[PDB]
Structures are given as C-alpha cells and as structure tokens.
Amino acid sequence: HAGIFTFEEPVTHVSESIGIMEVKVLRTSGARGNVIVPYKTIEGTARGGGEDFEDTCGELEFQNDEIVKTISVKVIDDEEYEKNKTFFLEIGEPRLVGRPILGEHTKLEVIIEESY
Ligand SMILES: [Ca+2]
Ligand SMILES: [Ca+2]
C-alpha cells in the first residue's frame, strides 16, 4: 500500500516571467510508509545551469500518509524576444525507506512561453 507516484499531467505551459514554477508529485492508491522519489530537470531548447532555468534535481521524501509534494524550479526571465523554449522534469524509481511504483505521468515537458 506504498503508493503509485505521478506528475499531474505530461505537458505544462508557463510564462517566461513565472519566476518560480511549482510542479506537483502525487501519491495515489496508498500512502503507507516513507518513500523516496528521485527527480531531475533535463534541458530541451531551454538551457539549464541558470540560463533559462535553474537545474533542479534530488529526491522527494513522502512521509507516511503524505500524498502530495512540490518541486520548485526557478525560471529565468530575460530581455530578448525568442521562440518558446522547452525543458523536462522526470521522476525516478520510488523506494521505501508492496513496493511503491511509478504511475501514469513520469515525464513532464515544460513549455516556457516568451514574455516579451
Ligand atoms: Ca533566456
Ligand atoms: Ca524572452
């Protein structure tokens, strides 16, 4: 009963001026025990390392009966006019600290919409 872990949706649009994007990870079908869920950002046409966004990777620890957590990603606005750019987040194999598992949405494409 350890849970099935998922993003809300596989694609999201955010403004280049959003500042901080807050991405949710949901636990469904069971909330028993402490579970570690790895996550990471991956570049698309948007560049990481603090250029278009800040690299954000690590692990979420869900406590017993905890069913939602947040990954906060810094999205960096600029003064250039360009096309919309993309990056990704992924969640990795969950582990107890009966097994927890990944659910429907395990890769998320973020489309950063030019703010002008
Ligand atoms: Ca930029
Ligand atoms: Ca821009």
What is the residue extent of each domain of the chain? 1-116
- Give the pairing type, strands 58-62 and 85-91: unpaired
Question: Rounded distance, CA 60 to CA 95, Å?
Answer: 11
Method: X-ray
Please give the distance, rounded to the nearest whole angstrom, from the Cα atom of residue 71 to the centre of ligand 2.
Answer: 23
Is 88:44 a contact under the CB 8 Å cutoff?
Answer: yes
Question: Rounded distance, CA 1 to CA 65, Å?
Answer: 11
Kindly identify the ligand whose nearest atom is closest to the C-alpha of 79.
Answer: 2
Strand partners, 99: none
- Give the pairing type, strands 107-113 and 11-15: parallel
Domain 1-116 coded CATH 3.60.9.10: no
Question: Rounded distance, CA 29 to CA 27, Å?
Answer: 7
Question: Which residues, 6+ apart, have CB-to-CB distance to 79 below 8 Å?
Answer: none
Kindly identify the ligand whose nearest atom is closest to the C-alpha of 51.
Answer: 1
Quoted resolution (Å): 1.7
| Residue 80 neighbours by CB distance under 10 Å | 8
Is 108:90 a contact under the CB 8 Å cutoff?
Answer: yes
Please give the distance, rounded to the nearest whole angstrom, from the Cα atom of residue 51 to the centre of ligand 1.
Answer: 6
Please give the distance, rounded to the nearest whole angstrom, from the Cα atom of residue 75 to the centre of ligand 1.
Answer: 9
Question: Rounded distance, CA 40 to CA 1, Å?
Answer: 25
Question: Rounded distance, CA 75 to CA 50, Å?
Answer: 8
| Residue 16 neighbours by CB distance under 10 Å | 20
Is 42:7 a contact under the CB 8 Å cutoff?
Answer: no
Question: Radius of gyration (Cα) for the chain, nearest Å?
Answer: 15
**CA 80 centroid distance within chain:** 26
Please give the distance, rounded to the nearest whole angstrom, from the Cα atom of residue 72 to the centre of ligand 2.
Answer: 21
Annotated binding site for Ca(2+): 16, 52, 78-80, 114
